[PDB]
Amino acid sequence: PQITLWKRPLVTIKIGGQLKEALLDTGADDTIIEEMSLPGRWKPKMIGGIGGFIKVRQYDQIIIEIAGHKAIGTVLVGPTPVNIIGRNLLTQIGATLNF
């Protein structure tokens, strides 16, 4: 698609066999989702946002579909206002900003 920005760029994602809503966020280095069960081991990560830095859980090589596009990569889990698809997975699905 070509997505304009008059409203929030919200899409459906599928993770763990469940559909969720997520924000496509070019200002997010990383993908972070609200608390849920993911398989495997996790590692600690510090991420920075508007209010400061927080520690979150990092899961690697997670299968995730984004607006129908398949990705496999790093998903963080932690306190987040919305599920966020950031540049690590935006790049995998071939997203660019154009003007």
Catalytic positions are 25
Question: Of 7-15, 21-29, 33-41, 68-76, which part binds Cl ion (CB under 5 A)?
Answer: 68-76
The two structure tokens encoding residue 71: 């990705």
Residues 6+ apart with CB under 8 A from 77: 32, 33, 34, 35, 36, 38, 42, 56, 57, 59
Residues 6+ apart with CB under 8 A from 33: 15, 20, 22, 75, 76, 77, 80, 83, 84
Among candidate residues 42, 45, 25, 11, the one with its CA nearest the CA of residue 89: 25
Which is nearer to a copy of itself, 17 or 52 (by Cβ)? 52
Of the candidate residues 10, 47, 63, 93, the single one contacting ligand 478 (CB under 6 A): 47
Question: Of 12-20, 33-41, 57-65, 80-88, which part binds a copy of itself (CB under 8 A)?
Answer: 80-88
Note the residues at the interface with ligand 478 (CB under 6 A).
23, 25, 27-30, 32, 47-50, 81-82, 84, 86
Contacting residues toward a copy of itself, per CB under 8 A = 1-6, 8-9, 23-29, 32, 47-54, 67, 69, 79-82, 84, 87, 90-91, 93-99
